[PDB]
Write an enzyme that holds these catalytic residues in place. Structure first.
Site, PDB file in Angstrom:
ATOM      1  N   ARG A  93       1.898  -1.290   3.292  1.00  0.00           N
ATOM      2  CA  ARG A  93       0.756  -2.075   3.629  1.00  0.00           C
ATOM      3  C   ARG A  93       1.084  -3.524   3.842  1.00  0.00           C
ATOM      4  O   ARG A  93       1.970  -4.093   3.313  1.00  0.00           O
ATOM      5  CB  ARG A  93      -0.370  -1.901   2.606  1.00  0.00           C
ATOM      6  CG  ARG A  93      -0.180  -2.612   1.292  1.00  0.00           C
ATOM      7  CD  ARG A  93       0.865  -2.034   0.333  1.00  0.00           C
ATOM      8  NE  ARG A  93       0.628  -0.603   0.081  1.00  0.00           N
ATOM      9  CZ  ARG A  93       0.028  -0.014  -0.955  1.00  0.00           C
ATOM     10  NH1 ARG A  93      -0.387  -0.685  -2.013  1.00  0.00           N
ATOM     11  NH2 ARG A  93      -0.188   1.302  -0.937  1.00  0.00           N
ATOM     12  N   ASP A  98      -4.217  -6.323  -6.299  1.00  0.00           N
ATOM     13  CA  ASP A  98      -4.628  -5.515  -7.414  1.00  0.00           C
ATOM     14  C   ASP A  98      -5.080  -6.408  -8.496  1.00  0.00           C
ATOM     15  O   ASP A  98      -4.375  -7.266  -8.819  1.00  0.00           O
ATOM     16  CB  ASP A  98      -3.464  -4.574  -7.902  1.00  0.00           C
ATOM     17  CG  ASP A  98      -3.261  -3.342  -6.998  1.00  0.00           C
ATOM     18  OD1 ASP A  98      -4.076  -3.057  -6.129  1.00  0.00           O
ATOM     19  OD2 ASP A  98      -2.301  -2.690  -7.193  1.00  0.00           O
TER      20      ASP A  98
HETATM   21  N1  LIG Z   1      -7.891  -3.195 -10.854  1.00  0.00           N
HETATM   22  C1  LIG Z   1      -8.129  -2.875  -9.593  1.00  0.00           C
HETATM   23  N2  LIG Z   1      -7.731  -3.654  -8.614  1.00  0.00           N
HETATM   24  C2  LIG Z   1      -7.978  -3.320  -7.346  1.00  0.00           C
HETATM   25  N3  LIG Z   1      -8.596  -2.182  -6.927  1.00  0.00           N
HETATM   26  C3  LIG Z   1      -9.004  -1.318  -7.828  1.00  0.00           C
HETATM   27  C4  LIG Z   1      -8.803  -1.634  -9.246  1.00  0.00           C
HETATM   28  N4  LIG Z   1      -9.298  -0.620  -9.945  1.00  0.00           N
HETATM   29  C5  LIG Z   1      -9.801   0.268  -9.043  1.00  0.00           C
HETATM   30  N5  LIG Z   1      -9.603  -0.137  -7.798  1.00  0.00           N
HETATM   31  C6  LIG Z   1     -10.030   0.675  -6.637  1.00  0.00           C
HETATM   32  O1  LIG Z   1      -8.841   1.226  -6.095  1.00  0.00           O
HETATM   33  C7  LIG Z   1      -9.071   1.687  -4.773  1.00  0.00           C
HETATM   34  C8  LIG Z   1      -7.782   2.187  -4.112  1.00  0.00           C
HETATM   35  O2  LIG Z   1      -6.898   1.148  -3.902  1.00  0.00           O
HETATM   36  P1  LIG Z   1      -5.404   1.382  -3.302  1.00  0.00           P
HETATM   37  O3  LIG Z   1      -5.363   2.332  -2.179  1.00  0.00           O
HETATM   38  O4  LIG Z   1      -5.034  -0.001  -2.943  1.00  0.00           O
HETATM   39  O5  LIG Z   1      -4.376   1.964  -4.506  1.00  0.00           O
HETATM   40  P2  LIG Z   1      -2.837   1.333  -4.655  1.00  0.00           P
HETATM   41  O6  LIG Z   1      -2.879  -0.128  -5.003  1.00  0.00           O
HETATM   42  O7  LIG Z   1      -2.082   1.739  -3.451  1.00  0.00           O
HETATM   43  O8  LIG Z   1      -2.120   2.133  -5.890  1.00  0.00           O
HETATM   44  P3  LIG Z   1      -1.984   1.617  -7.416  1.00  0.00           P
HETATM   45  O9  LIG Z   1      -3.371   1.440  -7.972  1.00  0.00           O
HETATM   46  O10 LIG Z   1      -1.274   2.824  -7.983  1.00  0.00           O
HETATM   47  O11 LIG Z   1      -1.109   0.402  -7.342  1.00  0.00           O
HETATM   48  C9  LIG Z   1      -9.860   0.489  -4.254  1.00  0.00           C
HETATM   49  O12 LIG Z   1     -10.676   0.808  -3.154  1.00  0.00           O
HETATM   50  C10 LIG Z   1     -10.683  -0.011  -5.451  1.00  0.00           C
HETATM   51  O13 LIG Z   1     -12.016   0.480  -5.463  1.00  0.00           O
HETATM   52  N1  LIG Z   2       8.204  -2.415  -5.496  1.00  0.00           N
HETATM   53  C1  LIG Z   2       6.928  -1.924  -5.216  1.00  0.00           C
HETATM   54  N2  LIG Z   2       6.801  -0.601  -5.153  1.00  0.00           N
HETATM   55  C2  LIG Z   2       5.489  -0.316  -4.952  1.00  0.00           C
HETATM   56  N3  LIG Z   2       4.937   0.924  -4.860  1.00  0.00           N
HETATM   57  C3  LIG Z   2       3.643   0.783  -4.669  1.00  0.00           C
HETATM   58  S1  LIG Z   2       2.608   2.168  -4.485  1.00  0.00           S
HETATM   59  C4  LIG Z   2       2.449   2.331  -6.351  1.00  0.00           C
HETATM   60  C5  LIG Z   2       3.400   3.150  -7.265  1.00  0.00           C
HETATM   61  C6  LIG Z   2       3.532   4.520  -7.127  1.00  0.00           C
HETATM   62  C7  LIG Z   2       4.376   5.263  -7.938  1.00  0.00           C
HETATM   63  C8  LIG Z   2       5.091   4.608  -8.918  1.00  0.00           C
HETATM   64 CL1  LIG Z   2       6.105   5.535  -9.891  1.00  0.00          CL
HETATM   65  C9  LIG Z   2       4.967   3.267  -9.101  1.00  0.00           C
HETATM   66  C10 LIG Z   2       4.128   2.530  -8.272  1.00  0.00           C
HETATM   67  N4  LIG Z   2       3.274  -0.533  -4.677  1.00  0.00           N
HETATM   68  C11 LIG Z   2       4.424  -1.235  -4.889  1.00  0.00           C
HETATM   69  C12 LIG Z   2       4.641  -2.543  -5.027  1.00  0.00           C
HETATM   70  O1  LIG Z   2       3.712  -3.552  -4.974  1.00  0.00           O
HETATM   71  N5  LIG Z   2       5.935  -2.867  -5.223  1.00  0.00           N
HETATM   72 CA   LIG Z   3      -4.512  -1.727  -4.449  1.00  0.00          CA
HETATM   73 CA   LIG Z   4      -1.044  -1.367  -5.890  1.00  0.00          CA
END
Ligand SMILES: Nc1ncnc2c1ncn2[C@@H]1O[C@H](COP(=O)(O)OP(=O)(O)OP(=O)(O)O)[C@@H](O)[C@H]1O
Ligand SMILES: Nc1nc2[nH]c(SCc3ccc(Cl)cc3)nc2c(=O)[nH]1
Ligand SMILES: [Ca+2]
Ligand SMILES: [Ca+2]
Ligand SMILES: [Ca+2]
Ligand SMILES: [Ca+2]
Ligand code: NA
Length: 159
Positions: A93, A98
């Site tokens: 992306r 987050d």
């Molecule tokens: N703390 C948070 N920060 C941001 N988004 C959040 C949070 N908690 C829940 N969400 C929700 O998460 C949804 C999915 O976000 P996203 O596809 O970006 O997951 P990701 O960031 O790729 O994976 P991860 O959460 O494992 O890092 C958002 O649409 C939002 O509603």
């Molecule tokens: N280095 C880096 N790797 C990433 N992977 C993702 S998807 C989340 C995720 C998925 C599986 C595991 Cl096990 C850990 C994290 N986001 C980032 C990021 O911001 N930085």
């Molecule tokens: Ca996110």
């Molecule tokens: Ca993330």
């Protein structure tokens, strides 16, 4: 006011330009001020690995927004910077913002889960966080310094 901590990641479309745009945008969030920005780190992708390395950073943002109002802003910034949802789980992306922490709050609503569900397991979140907030204590009383002393987390390299 409350201090929120936002994790920043980009691995597409020139991460350095995406992160610098996003910090200008975060500044323009209403009722909210950046207090600190961490260094930028170049990190190898976790999860799927067939994608570019990430630029990861963290920002301390002081706000009197409600937590889901902050989430409406961050999701807007993401969409404005070309974030598109593909079907692949955890794919690349242009920007990811987050919400790690929102003061000492624990938030579980339909759209928002805070603390970030897996941040205590991710060095690319914890190291930038510690650089801007070494004294941080989580809502459960866990100390960020203690987590990083005791647990094995690979060292991060600067972008
Ligand atoms: N703390 C948070 N920060 C941001 N988004 C959040 C949070 N908690 C829940 N969400 C929700 O998460 C949804 C999915 O976000 P996203 O596809 O970006 O997951 P990701 O960031 O790729 O994976 P991860 O959460 O494992 O890092 C958002 O649409 C939002 O509603
Ligand atoms: N280095 C880096 N790797 C990433 N992977 C993702 S998807 C989340 C995720 C998925 C599986 C595991 Cl096990 C850990 C994290 N986001 C980032 C990021 O911001 N930085
Ligand atoms: Ca996110
Ligand atoms: Ca993330
Ligand atoms: Ca502002
Ligand atoms: Ca893939
Ligand atoms: Na308001």
């Amino acid at each position: 006011m409350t201090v929120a901590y936002i994790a920043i990641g980009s691995n597409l479309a020139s991460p350095l330009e995406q992160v610098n745009a996003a910090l200008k945008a975060l500044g323009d969030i209403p009722e909210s001020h950046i207090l600190t920005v961490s260094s930028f780190y170049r990190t190898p992708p976790l999860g799927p690995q067939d994608q570019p390395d990430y630029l990861n950073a963290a920002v301390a943002l002081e706000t009197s927004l409600a937590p889901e109002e902050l989430l409406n802003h961050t999701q807007r910034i993401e969409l404005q910077q070309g974030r598109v949802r593909k079907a692949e789980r955890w794919g690349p992306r242009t920007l990811d913002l987050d919400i790690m922490l929102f003061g000492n709050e624990v938030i579980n609503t339909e759209r928002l889960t805070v603390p970030h569900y897996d941040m205590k397991n991710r060095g690319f979140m914890l190291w930038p966080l510690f650089e801007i907030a070494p004294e941080l204590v989580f809502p459960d009383g866990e100390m960020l310094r203690q987590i990083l002393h005791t647990r094995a987390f690979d060292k991060l390299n600067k972008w």
